[PDB]
Design an enzyme around this catalytic site. Structure first.
Site, mmCIF file in Angstrom:
data_model
loop_
_atom_site.group_PDB
_atom_site.id
_atom_site.type_symbol
_atom_site.label_atom_id
_atom_site.label_comp_id
_atom_site.label_asym_id
_atom_site.label_seq_id
_atom_site.Cartn_x
_atom_site.Cartn_y
_atom_site.Cartn_z
ATOM 1 N N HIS A 14 0.874 -1.160 0.000
ATOM 2 C CA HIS A 14 0.000 0.000 0.000
ATOM 3 C C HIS A 14 0.917 1.217 0.000
ATOM 4 C CE1 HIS A 14 -3.482 2.340 0.228
ATOM 5 N NE2 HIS A 14 -3.707 2.348 1.529
ATOM 6 N N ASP B 197 -2.701 -0.206 13.053
ATOM 7 C CA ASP B 197 -3.680 -0.358 12.004
ATOM 8 C C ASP B 197 -4.625 -1.496 12.343
ATOM 9 O OD1 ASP B 197 -4.899 -0.529 9.348
ATOM 10 O OD2 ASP B 197 -3.506 -2.213 9.031
#
Lengths: 321, 321, 321
Positions: free
Chosen positions: B135, B230
């Protein structure tokens, strides 16, 4: 003397007649320059709009999307499958992300409270695209249309015949400020919100205008200049929703209904229209302003965006209200 | 001396620190001119972008859509109900059609291999909008944010506390190139990819930086400047996904976790955030850079597009890294 | 001497060869100026397009969306979850709302009659984005591609091998007007529409061109310059749709099929392509114009929009047809 830039449009309740008049004036101006003079005005160049829709739409979606783009901005269409709202994210967090990525948000939500929260946390204007309590942008389009028809608004008597919904609440929050009278008919048990009604009375009192609430379709239509209705049958699929078919008997607007209204009467319907609320004789009658009403959804939402996001000032001469 | 035009951004693995630095520099430049100076820069006028999303999104969708449009290009949003990908069409055929109709594609797919195939066949840049392995655009936003906070990056120690996912892999593929140290904690059995880790070590070695892998949240937080976490709970609805609630016990970042970190510590979270990964004390703490981090998703993806599609060169003076 | 502005494009049946030629000419012009010369032409600035899709798409969606935006207009993508069409609203009412909010509509519907109604009521151009009866915009892309390959069209023999669908009907409604011959093969029971065929004969007669209808794949391919096929297997998931796998035996275009065609033969397929209609040898053969054909979907729909909405006149010298 009107400063709208940066404000939210959650409900007409917070705007003075002078301010709502500014918006219609801007609506006329924009319509004149673009539709009549054919000019291109990139007033929103470099801006973006977040359109969050929890429910279907076409009138609001189309008018808002083409309208925002017509002025050079980029409209961003979002739905429940897009947002994380409700499923994977809070509201305070979403208002902050949006506030850094768009210049304004137009939201069609189920709860009015959600718009309040959203506005509390967001630092960019929030426009109500329709909620349970109100539908102010619909009224802006209606008034401009009436203005374009009668040359003025003050003195007109609006006759509401239908459910005690968001449209009526928005009408109640604004008619008196234009010096217009309101006669509304709703079945027993489908009365408009008690606190909204309480405020409409006060507005009626402060502007010396009439406010009549009845359960009689004809008593409401009696003497009115504008007959206004709206779909009252619930999307709640159910052979038990007959309650509305049974409570709303006699509410279908027909030429019979018009027989008791002012001779210069016109008809309004926010759409989509079904054969229950009104028949084809009235609906496609030359007294029906339904389509010019729909078109004005575009010019008015454009005016809203411009007045909340720019310093643009109207070229056109202030209209007669 | 940096030539990025025409390249794909599938993973930070293929970019040198000098190149990643160019992108952040461009990010700062664009943010300065547009957000601060208020200029309008149609750098992408006449260009279009194909945004293919196989999964939900908001941060990536919004930032990428408003960002591309802000520079004058047209963002085209596509989903699984739009594309024929997987259902009625191959991949080699889709890469060719897209290559003749858009100037670049941003894809959020499940498989990294799909992006590789796509790039092999397409003749226009392919940008990774998030995949199973990486990402990278998220990291661009993170570093710019850290840069804006600490005035430089070199020397900072990043402390990762969470799953061994795509974010960490991207951090591993880039931190060392900025002279930053990485201490990461992941539950046993949730270690980052073996080959990715093997490469992070080599990068750590070539840049004289530290790389610590542990299963201890506190050992990782110890001495770190930036605490990063996260969402680790899987969307895989299942009372058997408790494995993650059971394997990740003690991973919630709280002030306790911060007690052992550097005094100038800050916090990062790619969002959306849930109450498991971090509590409200740290999350809404004035040390949290979550929102400035989200906003930078816009400026960085804009920088990526500009550097892969134009010859635009930065006005702003090269930042201190 | 060609006045297309303001007309609908529901089917090539209503356009003369001179008019269809104008559109391809405009297609070449636009492609030359934008793709080759790199110019930016905001011919549709200030305009909007309503794209109503009842079915999936990519080729039409992408080409139409990027194409309209490339000329400065705003494309508005709508589906069945957006429109109220069919569910909450009539057609006469929708045509009127759209007519006041967009400058043109491109619709991909199931019924051709719906497009007729739509056009009858709407006061803005209606373009057929594909229907049960025709797919004219597909043919525009095909002819331009053939033109770009053979330097002219007149005299070419087109060989159709597949179902008697919309593509063939559109080919029938236009080939003769370009002086092209048509040899078509369709299984028994899958013949093209009787009234369409009846009209193709008349066109063939008025232009002195050949029109051959057979159930023989090879008899149709025999002597043809362009082999054209299209997916014949129905999306109607059913182990009883084998009827098409059983009726279309021998229809797969292969090098065997090409063995009996003209030596300068090329291949066309509107896509998406499956392994039944054609094999990889022909499909990825250097004689296949599939991809240049797909790309031309963009330039041609752009030409359609420009000629129906503007007064723009071609710079480029009229091509050789």
């Amino acid at each position: 003397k009107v400063q709208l830039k940066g404000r939210d449009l959650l409900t007409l309740k917070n705007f003075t007649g002078e301010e709502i008049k500014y918006m219609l004036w801007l609506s006329a101006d924009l319509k004149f320059r673009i539709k009549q003079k054919g000019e291109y005005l990139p007033l929103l160049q470099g801006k973006s709009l977040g359109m969050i829709f929890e429910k279907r739409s076409t009138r609001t979606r189309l008018s808002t999307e083409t309208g925002f783009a017509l002025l050079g901005g980029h409209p961003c269409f979002l739905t429940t499958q897009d947002i994380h709202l409700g499923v994977n994210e809070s509201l305070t967090d979403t208002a902050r992300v949006l506030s850094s990525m768009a210049d304004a948000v137009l939201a069609r939500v189920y709860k009015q409270s959600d718009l309040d929260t959203l506005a509390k946390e967001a630092s960019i204007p929030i426009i109500n695209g329709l909620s349970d309590l109100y539908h102010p942008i619909q009224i802006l389009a209606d008034y401009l249309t009436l203005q374009e028809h009668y040359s003025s608004l003050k003195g007109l008597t609006l006759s509401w015949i239908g459910d005690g919904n968001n449209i009526l609440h928005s009408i109640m929050m604004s008619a008196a400020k234009f010096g217009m009278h309101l006669q509304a008919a709703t079945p027993k048990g489908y009365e408009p919100d008690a606190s909204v009604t309480k405020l409409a009375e006060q507005y009626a009192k402060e502007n010396g205008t009439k406010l009549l609430l009845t359960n009689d379709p004809l008593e409401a239509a009696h003497g009115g200049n504008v007959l206004i209705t709206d779909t009252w049958i619930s999307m709640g699929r159910e052979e038990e929703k007959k309650k509305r078919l049974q409570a709303f008997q006699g509410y279908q607007v027909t030429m019979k209904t018009a027989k008791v209204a002012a001779s210069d009467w016109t008809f309004l319907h926010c759409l989509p229209r079904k054969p229950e609320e009104v028949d084809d004789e009235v609906f496609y009658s030359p007294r029906s302003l339904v389509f010019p009403e729909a078109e004005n959804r575009k010019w008015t939402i454009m005016a809203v965006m411009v007045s909340l996001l720019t310093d643009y000032s109207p070229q056109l001469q202030k209209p007669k209200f």
